[PDB]
């Protein structure tokens, strides 16, 4: 994919950090997998991702990562390699779902500028 139709929220290091979660809960969505610390509460929380886009829209999540004001990931939304293929839906479908579970724990939940240009919003 062109240089151009791939969106980099986070940096390298963002994300190949090792997390580890106090109260971990993860779930298969489909071809996704979610991952959230229940530990975490009462907190903002933005999601960020980097992802390839095609005729305006998110085609192919590589990953998304929850991120506290602080800066520590708290949850995380992958592609299962057994699933080469999603869709748009399928990332939809998660992030309604790991957004749920963080309010769940009275966290105040955002998505990046270009999540939400690229996928999640009307």
């Given at each position: 994919t062109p240089a151009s139709r791939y969106i980099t929220d986070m940096t390298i290091e963002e994300l190949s950090r090792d997390w580890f979660m106090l109260m971990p809960k993860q779930k298969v969505e489909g071809p996704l997998c979610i991952r959230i610390d229940?530990?975490?509460?009462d907190k903002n929380i933005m999601l960020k991702a980097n992802f390839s886009v095609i005729f305006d829209r998110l085609e192919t999540l590589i990953l998304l990562r929850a991120f506290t004001e602080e800066g520590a990931i708290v949850g995380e939304i992958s592609p299962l390699p057994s699933f080469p293929g999603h869709t748009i839906e399928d990332v939809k479908n998660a992030i309604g779902v790991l957004i749920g579970g963080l309010e769940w724990n009275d966290n105040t939940v955002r998505v990046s500028k270009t999540l939400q240009r690229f996928a999640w919003g009307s």
């Open positions: 229940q530990a975490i509460m």
